[PDB]
Design a protein around this ligand. Sequence first.
Ligand SMILES: *[C@@](O)(c1nnc(C(C)(C)C)o1)[C@@H](NC(=O)Cn1c(-c2ccccc2)ncc(N)c1=O)C(C)C
Length: 240
Amino acid sequence: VVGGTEAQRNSWPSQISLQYRSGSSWAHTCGGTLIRQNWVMTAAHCVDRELTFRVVVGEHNLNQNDGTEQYVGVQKIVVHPYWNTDDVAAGYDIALLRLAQSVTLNSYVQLGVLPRAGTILANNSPCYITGWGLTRTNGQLAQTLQQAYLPTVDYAICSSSSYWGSTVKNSMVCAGGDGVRSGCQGDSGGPLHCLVNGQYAVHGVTSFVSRLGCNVTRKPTVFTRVSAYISWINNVIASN
Ligand SMILES: *[C@@](O)(c1nnc(C(C)(C)C)o1)[C@@H](NC(=O)Cn1c(-c2ccccc2)ncc(N)c1=O)C(C)C
């Protein structure tokens, strides 16, 4: 997250860190959202590689024992049937991970609430992106969970020429684009929390940014619109 601030320890309990084993250690690669005690929602492009993954919940500082972490393995990965490797502009950038074990819920580990199917947010809706991603373009990962106020940019504006044009689809959500704050490498697969009716719900799964850089003016961070896949999500968990 570029232009963010450190999130409080118990602010975003649904956030998880998706890690893969590199050598004899584990390294954070993407974010994700806990939606069931044994199911995690993330980006398809995060699990496109033939790597061994693990999930960490109750995580705050990547390199320090917080005394709240739970480490669980991934037992099954379900990518959207229409997902096309490396083709993030086509959409369908979403995947579900079935955990090897059910995690324990407490003040640091909670399920993120999903929006009702078809829900679209008004322009400039208050949202927050969270993650341990790069704090600067071509910089380095954050040590502690970061958060940044990222207001939505409706489809009409985001799909305009001065913005993303045809690259963005209606199955996506645009947030930010002020040139100061944004998502960045390592935030992928994570949640976009938006305030709706006094409650925070996960309306997006972080997908991509401009090839030019993370925080580019008029190039908001793009997310998969969660509300467009509620039926798919329910179908997967129900038969797995
Ligand atoms: C997303 O954070 C993410 N996913 N993988 C990674 C690495 C491996 C840590 C860099 O970071 C990142 N978004 C993207 O990387 C999306 N992206 C791609 C792309 C496509 C397929 C697989 C990986 C990456 N390609 C081009 C551009 N412009 C992208 O943003 C953050 C959300 C910024």
